[PDB]
Amino acid sequence: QLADYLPTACADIWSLRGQAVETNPLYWLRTIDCADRLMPVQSRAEARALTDDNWQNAFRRGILLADAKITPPERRAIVTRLEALSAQIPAQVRPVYQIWHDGQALQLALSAERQRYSKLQQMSDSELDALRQQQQALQTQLD
Amino acid sequence: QLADYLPTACADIWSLRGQAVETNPLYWLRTIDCADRLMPVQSRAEARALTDDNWQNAFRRGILLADAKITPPERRAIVTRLEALSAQIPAQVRPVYQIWHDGQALQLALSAERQRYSKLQQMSDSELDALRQQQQALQTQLD
């Protein structure tokens, strides 16, 4: 039987500290639910009130900044830092972190696929332009 | 305070039924953790005994089949059915479903992006071919 931190207000959830809250999966579940309700300007403001010296603050910061319109390099650094400290996460919290990490990894894969698409778009047009110029040369020669 | 079903054995988590278990987010969190441990053949063997009649069985079935190597149309049908039933999910469970649904929506977007990429690959080769044929026909006539 665990404590229920879900009814905790989203305005006060980012102020709770201690081992009692940081080992409860229902607390971390509430932080993700509360961060999903915030706008990018509020998420970054709450993230500025946190550091990343330990796994607790790094998890809070990553949860807040995930939807704060960050760049793919910024999301990759957040995931990499948490993956290095994920061994310190208690076992009861890890299922929450694993689901959150899988979503962030899918966002990184999505951004990587967007970049591959634009690279193909530019590669295709560059190859099409070369054949076009060769066609214009032959057409002018025939004319 | 909420009951803790995280230490519940993964071999017996699929047989748990009732309103006391299905309204506890820790039960559904353990369900996702246990399904992540199963191979596609084991996930399908558990999910084949269930259907999508209600939100409880549809969620259990979708959690098991998420990593069972299903097709994008099959995952879309599971997500769409659960979205229609998401109104009946209790408030304390919805944070578990929302993060699970967001991960499934990212998999659908990743599948659509990959299909769009191969679509560009075929359209690019088709246009390149058409220019190559035009160039060749121009060369023979130039000769």
Residue numbers in the entry:
A (entry chain A), B (entry chain B): 58 to 200
Can you list sentences taken from the study reporting this PDB entry?
Here, we report that the outer membrane lipoprotein QseG functions as an accessory protein that directly binds to and activates the histidine kinase QseE via its C-terminal domain. QseEF, a TCS responsive to multiple ligands including phosphate, sulfate, adrenaline, and AI-3, is essential for the virulence of pathogenic Enterobacteriaceae. Notably, genomic analyses reveal that a third gene qseG is co-transcribed with qseE and qseF, encoding an outer membrane lipoprotein anchored to the inner leaflet via N-terminal lipid modification. Collectively, our findings establish QseG as an endogenous activator of the QseEF signaling pathway via a conserved regulatory mechanism.
To refine atomic modeling, we additionally determined the crystal structures of QseG37-221 at 2.1 Å and the QseE sensor domain at 2.4 Å resolution. The lipoprotein QseG is anchored in the outer membrane, facing the periplasm under physiological conditions, with residues 1-36 comprising its signal sequence. The N-terminal region of each monomer QseG forms a globular fold with α-helices, whereas the C-terminus adopts a two-helix bundle, with each monomer contributing a long parallel helix. Following cleavage of the secretion signal peptide, the first N-terminal cysteine (herein, Cys37 within the long N-terminal loopC37-E57 of QseG in S. Typhimurium SL1344) undergoes lipidation, thereby anchoring QseG to the inner leaflet of the bacterial outer membrane. QseG37-end and QseG37-221 retained QseE-binding capability, whereas further C-terminal truncations (QseG37-214, QseG37-193, and QseG37-181) abolished this interaction. Consistent with the pull-down results, only QseG truncations that retained QseE-binding capacity induced autophosphorylation. These findings indicate that the QseG C-terminus is essential for QseE activation, highlighting QseG’s critical role in the QseEF TCS regulatory pathway. To assess the functional significance of the QseG-QseE interface, we introduced site-directed mutations in key QseG residues (L209D, E213A, R214A, R219A, and K220A) predicted to be essential for complex formation. Notably, the L209D and R219A mutations completely disrupted QseG-QseE complex formation (lanes 2, 9, 10, 13) and significantly reduced QseE autophosphorylation (lanes 2–4, lanes 1–3, 6). These findings highlight the crucial role of Leu209 and Arg219 in stabilizing the QseG-QseE interaction and activating QseE’s autokinase function.
